Design a protein around this ligand. Structure first.
Ligand code: FES
Length: 98
């Protein structure tokens, strides 16, 4: 499968559409497709690459930073998240945690 991923940057009012394989992390695909996104650890242990789901789902089982409540609230670590449906996500959401 290949999923459609819509990247929305609310602060800058930008929107990017990318296609991501079901076995590729969102971050990687974005970069390959020409859209640089924030990151630091690239290992699911920080909050630099955080995004917030608008719609769709993902598999971010490799993540270790977010707690259950943050996950329920829709936050995703883009560096270790695989899309599991078409997804709409707001990027650059780190500041939202604090
Ligand atoms: S860059 Fe650290 S969790 Fe994604």
């Amino acid at each position: 499968a290949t999923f459609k991923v819509t990247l929305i940057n609310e602060a800058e009012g930008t929107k990017h559409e990318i296609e991501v394989p079901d076995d590729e992390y969102i971050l990687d695909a974005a970069e390959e497709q020409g859209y640089d996104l924030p990151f630091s650890c690239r290992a699911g242990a920080c909050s630099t690459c955080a995004g917030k789901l608008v719609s769709g789902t993902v598999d971010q089982s490799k993540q270790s930073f977010l707690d259950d409540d943050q996950i329920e609230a829709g936050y995703v670590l883009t560096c270790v998240a695989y899309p599991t449906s078409d997804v709409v996500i707001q990027t650059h959401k780190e500041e939202d945690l604090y």
